[PDB]
């Protein structure tokens, strides 16, 4: 249904990246307006500067020369409710590298009662020359080797043993 | 049709008070908001439906001259009782006497007739 | 002998009251022959003509001593009154009583009385009677009042023995008269009518119709019997409602509460002020067109807010308020739903939204013990009381008997009829019109709505074909076999009948031609095990009729009351259970409606109907009717159904093979023939290795180690959740752990391949299952490896590891003996599958020929409001309005009568009782194809669904249950007495368990020497003592049945000091014995318990003040003060009863763990599957926010709630959703990849109606199975 996933922190220079930012409703039922500014700093730098505002349908980018011609939206379509507000960076460059904060204002709808919500996101990413794996998979593959040489080595081990008791027991008879 | 219990025929004497029953049963709790009755007068059969008291959020009364300090409410509407007191009856006032009442959620207007004959 | 007949003169009045006065100075049953009501044995022969009719003496010895007098009706009819006089007046000699009792003891009276009652009942049948018949009323009056005084002037009123208060029926009489008078002055109903209940007593003897006197003994013996079963019952739902009570108190008064308010107003200022619910839905969140606020929680895995509401206690419970834990009264109410499973999931569901989904625990245990165990028990008190009567009443005719017996031109017609029935035989013929029959029916199964003008048309001249070979073959039997013979065949009139009323429609009435499938029972004779159940089936059809006749009769009657005493507060008090302010679709305001609702509290649903008539018509009157109707009706007649079933499953030609002996003569001769004609034409290592795996295979460790294997790729399946995409790290371990538990499995199956070897893992079914398994695992690996996975077809196999849990069933003794019973039984469960579904299938082109395209409808889909029929007649007007507007659609149902198999689902539905309503008031308010459904056009479809539920419920649903009843008893015969449910080492226990309750002479404990010592001894072990406990202990249940919900700080206070003084008597008391009875205290099994709960008593106190003063956990507050119902527990030593319903309840836990095991199992498959295929569906009926399949947790409490059928109709509803009026099949779902919210219909039909199978036949029948075995051991 509406499942908030954290963004991903790291990306790749010369390729692209997908910032992902996820903000559900309580009750998935209700009737609402969400439009998002995005604003982001440099690592480096104590300033954070907004970069774009997505509307109902159209988007704003503000006129910064690091993020345009190279941000697209890749989030809701279609809808004033807008549950995904993530966006695309193509082309990335070693100055996409920083803290970001995706506001998400929601003004829901109810009988004669109309709130105003807000939530903001913080993620953090960085800009690689190289894609690296995370440890949770390298430490697992490794360990997955680990349990299948020990309990095969376990087996035979137990089969030799066995099988020097029994061989002794057939000669005996 | 809701229950209204009313005398067809009145009996008062010339210089008399009268009293007059109009009770009506609803299994709803009156609520005042909603609720409503008028008091009509009718000095013929054919004639006009002259009110001299209403009920609308209180009690209402329309200073007729034909009974010109005489109508008093007596009723409890809560107790479902919504008589009226005609105070020192003279001949000039037999006629009929109606009770129109409405007490939503019920959406049938309850109606009681009543002859009032000041014998002489 | 007859000799001793004579008129009872003072002088034999005198001869009996010395004879008193002699026994009084000085200081036996009755011939049952004799007895009164019944008739003078024929050894007295006749009566002379003048002591007929007259008060004579007394035969009966017993009574020749005390003081009565007989008299004898014209028909040798026995009746036994009083000497004493009459209110101290009357007298057997006065004349003014000789003249009662003439009237009394004679027929016309009582016929005459009969006749009024009923001329009554059919008058009150009526709604708004005729000004000029309420004098009838009055009429009656006096008729009764004068009924009561010839009676008690001829046997005066209550003082003495044989009086008119003394008989049971008269009481009845008596409340009825005197409920009349009171009402005469009071605004009460009429209750004239329940007096109707003397026919019940007339059909107790009744001889034209027979068998009607077992089936009313019966129905009055369960009821006197069932006494020990409802104290229990009482008890058992006061312990639990006063832990519901503890846990859920206030809870469902939460509400969700704006937080941003307007002026100044708070909770408060606005709650003082709010009255209807216009008002009340713009400060509480409700949800559209619901009645009640939103219910929510304050913990996590409760129900949630929207942004701009918090959750609340305020206002009042949902329901009307007739649903909540706020008092002991209503919680009491709430476990008797509970127990009678009556609407039990919205209360499941609104309990776990508003306190937490970790309180399912509650109602599992509930559930569980509570329902199925109580529901079993009064069951198998039912079965017990029918099978004795039966039984007596079979041997009581049998006596007679044997005593009886002890002691005693014209030949050419007559050519052409023999020519006729020469050809007429039954390898040719007979077995001609049967393929014949079964064509038809086959024809008649193929048509559907959407149809063409040809297809109907052919098949109409299909049906005249039919009908005219069958119409022919009727006049040749009948003139081979003349119209006496035709007549003197039971079998043959059936054919009669069709024929003729097939001949009247082809010169309403074509949905009676499925019946002829009846007839394909006698191929049945062939099959000798089918043979068998038809045999069965048919010794009980007598009793069925005479039941049915009970049945409805009964309804009747309480029908005519429900009319008569809530009809008007139905009409008048509308606008409180109805906003449009007409009468709702389920109303006793008529008879028509009454009868419904009656025969709905029957089929076990009562909640409902009883909140709308408690709000019109006052809570007791209301409860006390529904309560009545619901113990005679569903607790003993329902039962006493399935009772008679299970009776006639116990007590103690074939032409087909003519034929197959001509074939075997034609086959095999012709064959021979054409070959003629054709011929006229023309060192041990390998051993030493097989042996060492085998060692290895077989030890325990390795055992242990797959076992414990099973288990965690099990529970690692449970993780594959719709939130896997944020725990990363988790999926890759368990991709990886994938990997390695492949490779343990792959290694086990080679090393039992050299163990055993390829014949004996082959012809294994256990190894077979695991050899699957790890074969579908093994090729989704390679796929997957090989690159080319996400083929396609390779998720089906994805899906498939949700069997991967079955190999856990390999392992376990407890789930394996309770399979092996079920594979027991599964070949005398298909023979009767077949049985069923012929009924069912006729049941079903019925019901497509009624119904077929006309559950069409033009709604408007903002509000879901169907549209008046005088603004869219038809679906050409819902089209032209589907144009201009917008919000419009030509709607059909989802499960309807379409086509035989959509019948087949909707018949599962009303069988089982859920969705039924949808489908009965489509029914009833259909008026063609394509025209508008108006309101209740066809009222009297309700008949058609009455008649099915008759035949396809309690007839169908209960042969399943008989035949494998039986197959289980057969099974444990054939082992020799043996226990078909428990393990080797269950058995163990059982047989100390039994030896637990046999009762044993236990040695005295001795009497200390020390005079203090010895006295408190005297004191404890007197029986003085243990009353009196057991009565501190009931003024202890009382003081904590009087919390309440909103009590004053005062009402606390006093509640902790008097409970603070019952532990002090309690520890006091322990204190004394174990100073009296010194080390023979703990001795004593019961006595430890006291010892035990006297603890736990003090520490619950000390810690509960510590709980609630230094913390400020709630929730573990209530939680420990669940200990103090361990001192009402005791109030079960001193009941015997009680204590020896428990102990069958014991004896039977073992044998209800493997079952519990063994479902646990399957729920988790199911559970696994669930998540695969029903996470992403959208969420209409059943599924919602919290009760879905995105989570293990909420997947396994749906798969609770529908294991007992509760609401699997509301969960299948939106996975039959398939299509984009309805779906979208490109939704997007923020977090996932998965596009579409549809749903798959076969997938989602096949699962839930396998799921609710499989629980009907592994926990519904094995329940009822191991209680009717438990509760027979613990009562011998
Ligand atoms: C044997 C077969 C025949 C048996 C016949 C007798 C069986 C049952 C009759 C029970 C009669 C109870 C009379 C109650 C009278 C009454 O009106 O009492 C008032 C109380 C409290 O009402 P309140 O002031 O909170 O009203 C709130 C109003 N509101 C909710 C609209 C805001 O209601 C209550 O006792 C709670 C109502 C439930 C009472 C327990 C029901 C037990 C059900 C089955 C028992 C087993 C059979
Ligand atoms: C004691 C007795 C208990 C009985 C329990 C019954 C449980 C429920 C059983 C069945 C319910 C599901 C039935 C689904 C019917 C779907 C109807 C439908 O809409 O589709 C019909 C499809 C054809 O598809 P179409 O019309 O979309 O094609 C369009 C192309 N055009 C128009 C050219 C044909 O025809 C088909 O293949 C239909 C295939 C399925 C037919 C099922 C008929 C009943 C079979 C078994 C019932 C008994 C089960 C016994 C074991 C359990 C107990
Ligand atoms: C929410 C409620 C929260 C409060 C709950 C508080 C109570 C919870 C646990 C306390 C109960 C613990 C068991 C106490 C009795 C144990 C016992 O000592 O039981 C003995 C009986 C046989 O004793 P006997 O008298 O036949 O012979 C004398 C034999 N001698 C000489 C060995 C004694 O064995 C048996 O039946 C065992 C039967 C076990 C029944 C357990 C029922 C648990 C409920
Ligand atoms: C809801 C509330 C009601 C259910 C919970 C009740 C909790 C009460 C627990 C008390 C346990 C006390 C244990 C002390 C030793 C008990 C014992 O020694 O066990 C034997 C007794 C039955 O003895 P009997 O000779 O009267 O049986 C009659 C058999 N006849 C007729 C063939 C002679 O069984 C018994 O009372 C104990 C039976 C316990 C049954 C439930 C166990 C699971 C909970
Ligand atoms: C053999 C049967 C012998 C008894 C037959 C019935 C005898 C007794 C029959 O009594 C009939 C009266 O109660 C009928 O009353 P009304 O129709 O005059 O109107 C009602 C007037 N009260 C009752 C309200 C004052
Ligand atoms: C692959 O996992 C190896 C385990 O199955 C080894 O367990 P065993 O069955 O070898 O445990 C010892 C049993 N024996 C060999 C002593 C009989
Ligand atoms: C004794 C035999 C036991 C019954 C046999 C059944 C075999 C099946 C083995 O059953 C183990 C699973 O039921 C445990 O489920 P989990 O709680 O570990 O998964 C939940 C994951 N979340 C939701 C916590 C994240
Ligand atoms: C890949 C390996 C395939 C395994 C070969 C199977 C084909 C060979 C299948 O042959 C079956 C029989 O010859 C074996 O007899 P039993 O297993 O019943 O003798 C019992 C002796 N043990 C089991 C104690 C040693
Ligand atoms: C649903 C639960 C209902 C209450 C259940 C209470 C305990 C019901 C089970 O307890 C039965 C006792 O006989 C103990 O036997 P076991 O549990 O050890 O049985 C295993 C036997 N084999 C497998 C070792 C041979
Ligand atoms: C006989 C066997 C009967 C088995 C019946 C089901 C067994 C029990 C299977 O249900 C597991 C419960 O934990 C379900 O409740 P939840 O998972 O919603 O708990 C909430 C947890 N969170 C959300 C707080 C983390
Ligand atoms: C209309 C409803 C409420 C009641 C209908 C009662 C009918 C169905 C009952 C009442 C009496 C019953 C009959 C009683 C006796 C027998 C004899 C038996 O060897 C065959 C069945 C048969 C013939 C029963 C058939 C069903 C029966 C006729
Ligand atoms: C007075 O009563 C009459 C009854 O006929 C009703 O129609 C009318 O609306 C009432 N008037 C007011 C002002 O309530
Ligand atoms: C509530 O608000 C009003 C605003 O006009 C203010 O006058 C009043 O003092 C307030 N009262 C409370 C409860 O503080």
Same mark, same amino acid.
């Given at each position: ?9 790291? @990306? ?154 029994? @061989?002794?027991?057939?000669?005996? @008879? | ?120 | ?69 007989? +008299? ?239 959750? +609340? ?63 079993? *028990? ?263 159904? *399935? ?73 690692? *399946? ?174 059909? *149902? ?198 035990? +709960? ?178 027979? +051991?613990?009562?011998?």
């Amino acid at each position: 249904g509406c499942v908030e996933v954290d963004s991903e922190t790291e @990306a790749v220079y010369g390729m692209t990246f997908k910032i992902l930012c996820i903000s559900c409703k309580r009750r998935s039922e209700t009737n609402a307006e969400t439009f998002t500014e995005w604003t982001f700093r440099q690592k480096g730098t104590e300033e954070f500067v907004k970069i774009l505002r997505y509307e109902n349908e159209v988007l704003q980018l503000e006129e910064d020369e690091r993020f345009e011609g190279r941000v697209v939206w890749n989030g809701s379509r279609g809808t004033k409710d807008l549950q995904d507000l993530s966006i695309f960076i193509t082309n990335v460059t070693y100055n996409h590298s920083g803290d970001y904060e995706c506001h998400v204002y929601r003004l829901l709808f109810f009988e004669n009662y109309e709130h105003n919500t807000s939530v903001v996101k913080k993620i953090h990413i960085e800009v690689v020359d190289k894609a690296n794996r995370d440890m949770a998979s390298i430490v697992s593959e490794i360990m997955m080797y680990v349990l299948i040489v020990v309990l095969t080595i376990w087996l035979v081990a137990e089969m030799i043993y066995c099988y020097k008791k029994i @061989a002794a027991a057939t000669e005996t @008879a | 049709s809701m229950e209204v219990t009313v005398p067809a025929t009145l009996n008062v004497l010339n210089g008399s008070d009268a009293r007059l029953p109009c009770t009506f049963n609803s299994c709803y709790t009156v609520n005042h908001k909603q609720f409503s009755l008028n008091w009509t007068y009718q000095e013929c059969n054919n004639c006009s439906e002259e009110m001299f008291l209403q009920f609308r959020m209180k009690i209402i009364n329309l200073k007729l001259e034909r009974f010109q300090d005489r109508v008093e409410f007596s009723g409890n509407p809560s107790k479902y009782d919504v008589s009226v007191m005609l105070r020192n009856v003279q001949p000039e006032d037999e006629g009929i006497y109606n009770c129109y009442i409405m007490n939503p959620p019920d959406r049938h207007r309850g109606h009681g007739k009543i002859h009032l004959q000041v014998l002489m | 002998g007859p000799q001793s007949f004579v008129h009872f003169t003072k002088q034999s009045l005198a001869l009996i009251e010395q004879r008193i006065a002699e026994r009084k100075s000085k200081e036996p049953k009755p011939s049952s022959d004799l007895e009164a009501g019944k008739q003078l044995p024929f050894i007295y022969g006749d009566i002379p003509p003048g002591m007929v009719s007259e008060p004579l003496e007394d035969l009966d010895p017993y009574y020749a001593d005390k003081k009565t007098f007989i +008299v004898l009706n014209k028909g040798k009819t026995i009746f036994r009154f009083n000497a004493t006089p009459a209110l101290y007046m009357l007298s057997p000699f006065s004349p003014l009583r000789r003249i009662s009792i003439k009237i009394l003891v004679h027929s016309l009276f009582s016929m005459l009385i009969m006749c009024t009652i009923l001329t009554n009942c059919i008058f009150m049948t009526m709604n708004n009677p005729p000004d000029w018949t309420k004098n009838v009323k009055y009429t009656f009056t006096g008729i009764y009042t004068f009924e009561s005084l010839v009676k008690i002037l001829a046997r005066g009123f209550c003082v003495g023995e044989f009086t008119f208060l003394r008989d049971p029926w008269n009481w009845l009489d008596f409340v009825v008269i005197v409920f009349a008078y009171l009402t005469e002055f009071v605004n009460l109903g009429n209750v004239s009518a329940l007096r109707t209940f003397r026919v019940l007593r007339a059909l107790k003897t009744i001889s034209v119709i027979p068998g009607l006197k077992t089936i009313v003994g019966a129905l009055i013996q369960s009821v006197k019997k069932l006494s020990d079963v409802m104290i229990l019952t009482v008890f058992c739902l006061s312990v639990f409602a006063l832990i519901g009570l503890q846990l859920f108190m206030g809870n469902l008064k939460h509400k969700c509460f704006r937080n941003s308010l307007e002026n100044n107003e708070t909770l408060e200022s606005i709650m003082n002020t709010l009255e209807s619910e216009e008002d009340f839905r713009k400060y509480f969140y409700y949800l559209e067109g619901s009645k009640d606020a939103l219910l929510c929680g304050f913990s996590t895995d409760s129900g949630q807010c929207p942004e701009g509401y918090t959750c +609340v206690k305020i206002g009042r419970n949902p329901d009307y308020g007739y649903t909540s834990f706020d008092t002991f009264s209503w919680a009491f109410l709430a476990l008797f739903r509970l127990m009678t499973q009556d609407y039990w999931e919205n209360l499941y569901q609104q309990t776990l939204r508003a306190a937490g989904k970790t309180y399912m625990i509650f109602f599992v245990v509930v559930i569980f013990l509570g329902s199925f165990y109580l529901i079993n *028990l009064i069951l198998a008190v039912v079965a017990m009381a029918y099978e004795e009567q039966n039984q007596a009443n079979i041997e009581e005719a049998k006596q007679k008997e044997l005593e009886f017996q002890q002691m005693l031109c014209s030949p050419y017609w007559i050519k052409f009829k023999k020519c006729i029935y020469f050809i007429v035989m039954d390898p040719f013929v007979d077995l001609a019109i049967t393929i014949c029959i079964v064509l038809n029916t086959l024809f008649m199964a193929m048509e559907h709505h959407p149809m063409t003008e040809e297809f109907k048309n052919v098949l109409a001249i299909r049906n005249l074909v039919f009908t005219g070979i069958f119409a022919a073959e009727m006049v040749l039997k009948l003139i081979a076999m003349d119209p006496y013979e035709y007549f003197q065949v039971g079998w043959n009139i059936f054919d009669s009948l069709i024929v003729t009323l097939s001949l009247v429609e082809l010169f309403g009435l074509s949905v009676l031609r499925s019946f002829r499938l009846l007839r394909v029972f006698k191929l049945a004779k062939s099959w000798p095990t089918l043979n068998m159940l038809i045999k069965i089936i048919g010794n009980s059809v007598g009793a069925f009729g005479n039941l049915m006749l009970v049945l409805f009769i009964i309804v009747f009657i309480f029908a005519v009351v429900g009319m008569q005493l809530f009809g008007k507060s139905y009409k008048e008090c509308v606008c409180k259970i109805n906003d449009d302010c007409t009468l709702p679709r389920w109303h006793m305001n008529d008879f028509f409606h009454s009868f419904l609702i009656v025969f709905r509290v029957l089929c076990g649903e009562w909640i409902e109907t009883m909140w709308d008539c408690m709000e019109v018509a006052g809570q007791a009157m209301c409860l006390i009717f529904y309560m009545m109707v619901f113990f005679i009706g569903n607790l003993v007649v329902l039962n006493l159904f *399935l009772a008679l079933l299970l009776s006639s499953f116990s007590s103690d030609a074939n032409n087909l093979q003519i034929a197959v002996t001509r074939i075997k003569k034609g086959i095999n001769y012709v064959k021979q023939t054409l070959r003629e004609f054709i011929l006229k034409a023309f060192g041990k290592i390998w051993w030493n290795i097989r042996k060492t795996c085998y060692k290895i295979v077989e030890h325990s460790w390795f055992e242990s180690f797959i076992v414990l294997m099973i288990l965690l790729s099990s529970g690692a *399946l449970a993780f594959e959740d719709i939130y896997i995409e944020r725990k990363k790290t988790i999926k890759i371990i368990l991709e990886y752990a994938d990997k390695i538990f492949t490779y343990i499995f792959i290694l086990e199956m080679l090393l039992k391949w050299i163990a055993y070897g390829y014949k004996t893992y082959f012809t294994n079914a256990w190894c077979w299952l695991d050899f699957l398994i790890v074969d579908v695992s093994l090729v989704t690996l390679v796929a997957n490896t090989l690159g080319y996975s996400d083929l396609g077809p390779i998720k089906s196999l994805r899906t498939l590891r949700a069997l991967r849990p079955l190999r856990a069933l390999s392992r376990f003794e407890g789930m394996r003996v309770v399979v092996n019973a079920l594979i027991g039984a599964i070949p005398s469960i298909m023979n009767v599958l077949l049985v069923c579904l012929i009924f069912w299938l006729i049941f079903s082109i019925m019901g497509v020929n009624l119904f077929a395209g006309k559950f069409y409808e033009c709604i408007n889909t903002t509000d879901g409001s169907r549209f008046p029929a005088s603004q869219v007649p038809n679906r050409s007007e819902c089209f032209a309005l589907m144009n201009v507007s917008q919000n419009v659609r030509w709607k059909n *149902l989802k499960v309807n009568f379409d086509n035989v198999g959509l019948g087949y689902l909707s018949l599962l539905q009303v069988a089982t009782f859920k969705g039924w309503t949808i489908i009965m008031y489509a029914a009833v308010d259909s008026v063609n194809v394509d025209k508008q459904p108006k309101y209740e056009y066809s009222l009297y479809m309700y008949i058609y669904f009455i008649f099915f539920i008759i035949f396809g419920s309690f007839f169908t649903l209960n042969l399943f249950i008989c035949v494998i009843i039986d197959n289980f008893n057969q099974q444990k015969k054939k082992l020799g007495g043996q226990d078909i449910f428990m393990t080797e080492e269950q058995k163990k226990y059982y047989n100390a368990m039994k030896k637990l309750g046999s009762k044993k002479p236990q040695k005295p404990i001795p009497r200390p020497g020390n005079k203090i010592q010895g006295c408190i001894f005297d004191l404890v072990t007197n029986q003085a003592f243990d009353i009196s406990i057991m009565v501190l202990i009931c003024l202890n249940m009382v003081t904590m049945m009087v919390e309440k919900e909103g009590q004053s700080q005062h009402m606390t206070e006093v509640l902790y000091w008097i409970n603070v003084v019952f532990i002090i008597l309690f520890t006091g008391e322990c204190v004394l014995k174990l100073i009296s009875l010194r080390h023979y205290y703990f001795t004593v099994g019961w006595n430890i318990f006291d010892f035990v +709960v006297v603890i736990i008593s003090i520490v619950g106190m000390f810690l509960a003040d510590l709980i609630e003063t230094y913390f400020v956990s709630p929730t573990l507050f209530r939680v420990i003060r669940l200990a103090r119902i361990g001192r009402i527990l005791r109030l079960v030593k001193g009941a015997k009863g009680i204590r020896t319903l428990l102990f069958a309840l014991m004896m039977s836990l073992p044998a209800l763990f493997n079952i519990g095991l063994l479902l646990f199992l399957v729920m988790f498959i199911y559970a696994i599957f669930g998540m695969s295929n029903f996470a992403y569906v959208k969420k209409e009926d059943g599924i919602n926010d919290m009760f879905n399949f995105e989570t293990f947790g909420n997947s396994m409490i749906c798969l609770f709630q529908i294991t007992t059928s509760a609401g699997w109709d509301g969960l299948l509803a939106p996975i039959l959703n398939s299509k984009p009026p309805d779906c979208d099949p490109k939704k997007v779902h923020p977090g996932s990849s998965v596009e579409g919210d549809c749903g798959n219909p076969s997938v989602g039909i096949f699962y839930f109606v396998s799921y609710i199978i499989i629980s009907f036949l592994v926990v519904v029948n094995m329940y009822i199975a191991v209680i009717l075995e438990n509760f027979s +051991v613990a009562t011998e």
